[PDB]
């Protein structure tokens, strides 16, 4: 927090906590899926899946491999978007909406393209 | 002779007798484990040399438990002798209790005793969280562990335990600041000091505001056609 | 230590595998039993349907449970869930259908009144902060007609009490009631097919068909038999739903 | 009904008194906290010097 | 040490050897530096029976990290009673072996 | 008949008045507690700002 | 018995019989220390 | 049996068997849950937890690590208490009552301090 500020640090730590809990639950999930988890754990697992998909990005150097051009997300927008994710504000949207995109505008566009809406 | 390398170095940290001046040297060797493998060579040697260890884990660190002490396997081989009397009193079985709590939480992934133990352990785990570069005086730590192990955190939500601790310590430092002085001077928490501390905690609890808003005192739809209707059958033409 | 912990993991996985295989086979046998109990109840309900049809066609269509309530405001929803948890999506789909019904009910100004069978739905609604009026538990694995009897009696009493309940007030009776009785449960279509379905137990609806050669005698009067029989039909359909839910859960 | 009205009035008056007391206590605590924090800030400034 | 967890569960006395063992980036250096910084009150008392003099031995540590530790000690006023023995990663194996 | 209706209505009124009295007392106490917490927190924030700016200007 | 107890109670009749027989045989093969049995006695016990 | 006697040996063997079965069941309990065990196995798991806690003791030499003074349990009382445990006489007591105590009197007093009674 002394360097990147309180908000950025808080959002990053919350994201890391959610992903760590998902990693912990991997043992149960590999066998029984999400069904036997508590409602808190089910919610956190869905949130963690969305977060881990949203950490992916269409890189500039990846256009050679897939044709799709890259994207640049400003740091403030990244903090805002991941704060929204960690709060469960995008639970309704499908997982694939968060895959290989940029900021929140791209999220809305891909959610629309998938039949949902932000 | 790598074990000897470390042992002859670490045995020079000692507490001298009063004949030799009574001076002392405390050692804090650091060891980097790989993939959380405390069964490697150097980790085993140094663990078998030193007077206990504070094992730090990355899983606990990522979970928000910071410092990431693994209470189950962390231990001090001096024990209560290395604490002031007040800390001994408030924090007698804290490490043992937290180890038992982690065991129960793992097993109970229930009777009233189990739920009480789980809630107390969650509160205590929250209590021991501490940010970097925010040290606490021994008296403040005594008061915090008193909050924890004396049952005064049971009425506060687990999420507010850290904020409740910080605000109560600030209040005691602002007013009722003689409890800290007593713990500093006497190294022990007097009966009257405990009475005053309990009363102050109760009053602050009355004043304390929960994050949710309480007091810590003491989807798309079925197509209406799809909803199958339970209908009695009548053998008549409609009127 | 890597090899030691990894061998321990192998042993744990073996134990889990053995337990799961045994549970799968026992579940197969229980599917057989539940299906058999589903056929066992077909004739009674099938012919009591005929009895009810004869009574209705030989009587006025004016039973309190049969007449729609003007300005419906509270619809009763019964969620039939399981007691054990080792079913994968059973409870999840049941509760998704329950919510797909709750939103619809709120759409038409109907505030749902919640009743529960089983334990998992209790936890789900406790998380969702939706109060449960009444819960029955401990028989989802094999439901007997008795349990359906108490369930139907309680839901029918809740329905009837709403007749004298005015607005948010309970009126003369003093017991607030409901305007509808809805059932959410899993219809055991077949081995692969298990879909949750919302069903309106009440108020009863009427269909018609033009066609009589002979007239059934009644004792003492058709209306009395209709009155004494309609709650029995409610209980029978609830019991059938419970049997279907048990088969689907297995 | 008369008793209920009187009890409601008494509860409102007691609530007013208790709210005034709580507000005064919270005030005093606020000044105490501000004073101690200002002292700490002065100490830190002297340390920097 | 000023850390509730250590001081309450695994207390450290004078003359004891406590091992801070853990994976990368688990907070070991943070704990040790906080412990060193927590001795400033004792140093300011002026009583040598209370004062604790600190020694930090950086073995195979990147020089910039040693500088960062020295800065963290400076800001808290811990260098007044602390000595750093530095054997950075560029130092030959002799210094790395000899620093402790 | 009006007397009986009034008796029922006033019984309801007394019950709901007791309920509203206790609820309003609790609500006003909660509002006082929230105001106290707001005062304490704004004092804390003002103090934090004061210390930060004082140390910054001293360093400069 | 090992396969069907790793499985395991509401079993086919033959399977219940197998479980009971296997439990009995497992109890039969047990033996205290320093108590070897003559071949005839072992034959009778296994019988 | 020859040296320690029939009763001592029988109690020790029963305790060892119960603990072995509990260790066997621990993986299943960890993944699935205790509610999927047979009623006999649930009873055995409760007894095993109580037994493993009771095998702990407050040692004299451990005073400096806990503050609580140590205790001494005679062999006869130990055998009788563990015979009772293996038979489920103390199932109704909370497991925490069996943690770091001496004989059955200490068990009774600790269970009294937790609300339960012997
Ligand atoms: N109590 C704490 N709360 C929050 N962050 C902390 C805490 N303790 C340490 N950290 C942070 O964790 C990270 C790791 O700290 P540190 O460098 O001391 O660990 P380490 O195990 O010594 O690392 P390395 O392997 O790099 O030597 C740093 O960002 C430090 O700021
Ligand atoms: Mg380090």
Short mmCIF file of C-alpha atoms in Angstrom, two decimals, chain C residues 37-194:
data_model
loop_
_atom_site.label_atom_id
_atom_site.label_comp_id
_atom_site.label_asym_id
_atom_site.label_seq_id
_atom_site.Cartn_x
_atom_site.Cartn_y
_atom_site.Cartn_z
CA UNK C 37 -43.02 -47.70 -5.74
CA UNK C 38 -43.95 -45.20 -8.46
CA UNK C 39 -45.89 -47.84 -10.40
CA UNK C 40 -47.36 -49.15 -7.14
CA UNK C 41 -49.18 -45.84 -6.62
CA UNK C 42 -50.48 -45.44 -10.19
CA UNK C 43 -53.82 -47.30 -9.90
CA UNK C 44 -55.13 -45.57 -6.77
CA UNK C 45 -54.49 -42.06 -8.11
CA UNK C 46 -55.57 -43.01 -11.64
CA UNK C 47 -59.00 -44.18 -10.46
CA UNK C 48 -59.47 -41.57 -7.73
CA UNK C 49 -59.12 -39.15 -10.64
CA UNK C 50 -62.16 -40.86 -12.17
CA UNK C 51 -64.05 -40.65 -8.88
CA UNK C 52 -63.25 -36.94 -8.58
CA UNK C 53 -64.31 -36.38 -12.19
CA UNK C 54 -67.65 -38.11 -11.60
CA UNK C 55 -68.27 -36.07 -8.45
CA UNK C 56 -67.35 -32.81 -10.20
CA UNK C 57 -69.58 -33.58 -13.18
CA UNK C 58 -72.40 -34.48 -10.78
CA UNK C 59 -71.97 -31.43 -8.53
CA UNK C 60 -71.54 -27.68 -8.56
CA UNK C 61 -68.02 -26.40 -9.28
CA UNK C 62 -67.94 -24.19 -6.20
CA UNK C 63 -65.54 -25.74 -3.67
CA UNK C 64 -63.49 -23.11 -1.77
CA UNK C 65 -60.27 -24.80 -2.89
CA UNK C 66 -61.64 -24.78 -6.46
CA UNK C 67 -62.61 -21.10 -6.70
CA UNK C 68 -59.91 -18.62 -7.68
CA UNK C 69 -59.15 -15.83 -5.21
CA UNK C 70 -59.73 -12.31 -6.48
CA UNK C 71 -56.63 -10.11 -6.39
CA UNK C 72 -54.13 -12.91 -5.67
CA UNK C 73 -51.34 -11.61 -3.44
CA UNK C 74 -49.53 -14.57 -1.82
CA UNK C 75 -48.73 -17.79 -3.69
CA UNK C 76 -47.63 -20.82 -1.68
CA UNK C 77 -44.53 -22.55 -3.05
CA UNK C 78 -43.41 -25.94 -1.75
CA UNK C 79 -39.84 -26.91 -2.65
CA UNK C 80 -39.20 -30.66 -2.57
CA UNK C 81 -35.47 -31.16 -1.98
CA UNK C 82 -33.29 -34.02 -0.79
CA UNK C 83 -31.89 -34.87 2.64
CA UNK C 84 -28.50 -36.21 1.53
CA UNK C 85 -26.10 -34.25 -0.63
CA UNK C 86 -24.29 -36.75 -2.85
CA UNK C 87 -26.70 -35.93 -5.69
CA UNK C 88 -24.93 -33.63 -8.10
CA UNK C 89 -27.33 -31.09 -9.60
CA UNK C 90 -30.62 -32.35 -8.12
CA UNK C 91 -30.94 -29.68 -5.43
CA UNK C 92 -29.32 -27.03 -7.64
CA UNK C 93 -31.83 -27.54 -10.46
CA UNK C 94 -34.74 -27.76 -8.01
CA UNK C 95 -33.78 -24.41 -6.49
CA UNK C 96 -33.14 -22.77 -9.86
CA UNK C 97 -36.66 -23.79 -10.87
CA UNK C 98 -37.91 -22.49 -7.51
CA UNK C 99 -36.33 -19.10 -8.25
CA UNK C 100 -37.63 -19.17 -11.83
CA UNK C 101 -41.04 -19.47 -10.15
CA UNK C 102 -40.42 -16.91 -7.39
CA UNK C 103 -39.54 -14.18 -9.89
CA UNK C 104 -42.69 -14.94 -11.88
CA UNK C 105 -44.80 -14.80 -8.71
CA UNK C 106 -43.33 -11.43 -7.74
CA UNK C 107 -44.00 -10.24 -11.30
CA UNK C 108 -47.77 -10.48 -10.70
CA UNK C 109 -47.65 -8.94 -7.22
CA UNK C 110 -47.56 -12.38 -5.58
CA UNK C 111 -45.24 -12.61 -2.58
CA UNK C 112 -44.29 -16.30 -2.33
CA UNK C 113 -44.87 -18.18 0.92
CA UNK C 114 -42.16 -20.79 1.36
CA UNK C 115 -42.53 -24.41 2.46
CA UNK C 116 -39.68 -26.92 2.36
CA UNK C 117 -39.19 -30.68 2.16
CA UNK C 118 -35.63 -31.84 2.79
CA UNK C 119 -32.54 -30.16 4.17
CA UNK C 120 -30.51 -28.78 1.25
CA UNK C 121 -33.16 -26.23 0.28
CA UNK C 122 -33.16 -25.05 3.90
CA UNK C 123 -29.47 -24.20 3.62
CA UNK C 124 -29.90 -22.56 0.23
CA UNK C 125 -32.71 -20.31 1.45
CA UNK C 126 -30.90 -19.56 4.71
CA UNK C 127 -28.06 -18.26 2.55
CA UNK C 128 -30.56 -16.35 0.40
CA UNK C 129 -32.28 -14.95 3.54
CA UNK C 130 -35.73 -16.22 2.51
CA UNK C 131 -37.81 -17.34 5.49
CA UNK C 132 -39.35 -20.82 5.54
CA UNK C 133 -42.84 -21.10 7.00
CA UNK C 134 -42.65 -24.86 7.58
CA UNK C 135 -40.16 -27.62 6.84
CA UNK C 136 -40.40 -31.40 6.73
CA UNK C 137 -37.26 -33.52 6.84
CA UNK C 138 -35.92 -37.04 7.17
CA UNK C 139 -38.00 -38.91 4.58
CA UNK C 140 -36.89 -37.67 1.14
CA UNK C 141 -35.00 -40.93 0.57
CA UNK C 142 -38.28 -42.88 0.75
CA UNK C 143 -41.49 -40.88 1.26
CA UNK C 144 -44.51 -42.59 2.79
CA UNK C 145 -48.09 -41.49 2.27
CA UNK C 146 -48.28 -40.25 5.86
CA UNK C 147 -45.76 -37.46 5.26
CA UNK C 148 -47.63 -36.36 2.15
CA UNK C 149 -50.76 -36.35 4.31
CA UNK C 150 -49.33 -33.89 6.83
CA UNK C 151 -47.78 -31.77 4.06
CA UNK C 152 -51.05 -31.52 2.14
CA UNK C 153 -53.04 -30.84 5.31
CA UNK C 154 -50.75 -27.98 6.35
CA UNK C 155 -50.64 -26.42 2.88
CA UNK C 156 -54.41 -26.73 2.47
CA UNK C 157 -54.97 -25.09 5.86
CA UNK C 158 -52.66 -22.26 4.82
CA UNK C 159 -54.67 -21.91 1.60
CA UNK C 160 -58.06 -21.92 3.33
CA UNK C 161 -57.02 -19.40 5.98
CA UNK C 162 -56.40 -16.89 3.19
CA UNK C 163 -60.10 -16.83 2.30
CA UNK C 164 -60.92 -14.84 5.45
CA UNK C 165 -57.61 -12.94 5.39
CA UNK C 166 -57.98 -9.38 4.10
CA UNK C 167 -55.03 -7.46 2.73
CA UNK C 168 -52.18 -7.84 5.19
CA UNK C 169 -54.75 -8.63 7.91
CA UNK C 170 -55.97 -12.11 8.79
CA UNK C 171 -59.62 -11.13 9.24
CA UNK C 172 -62.01 -13.21 11.31
CA UNK C 173 -59.83 -16.32 11.51
CA UNK C 174 -56.76 -14.40 12.65
CA UNK C 175 -54.40 -16.73 10.75
CA UNK C 176 -52.81 -15.28 7.62
CA UNK C 177 -53.04 -17.56 4.60
CA UNK C 178 -52.06 -17.95 0.95
CA UNK C 179 -53.77 -17.53 -2.41
CA UNK C 180 -52.04 -20.38 -4.27
CA UNK C 181 -50.30 -23.70 -3.63
CA UNK C 182 -47.31 -24.35 -5.91
CA UNK C 183 -45.04 -27.41 -5.94
CA UNK C 184 -41.44 -27.48 -7.20
CA UNK C 185 -39.96 -30.95 -7.65
CA UNK C 186 -37.97 -33.13 -10.04
CA UNK C 187 -40.05 -35.14 -12.52
CA UNK C 188 -38.34 -38.50 -13.11
CA UNK C 189 -38.83 -38.71 -16.87
CA UNK C 190 -36.21 -41.46 -17.28
CA UNK C 191 -32.70 -42.45 -16.24
CA UNK C 192 -31.03 -39.56 -18.08
CA UNK C 193 -33.91 -37.08 -17.73
CA UNK C 194 -34.58 -35.38 -14.38
#
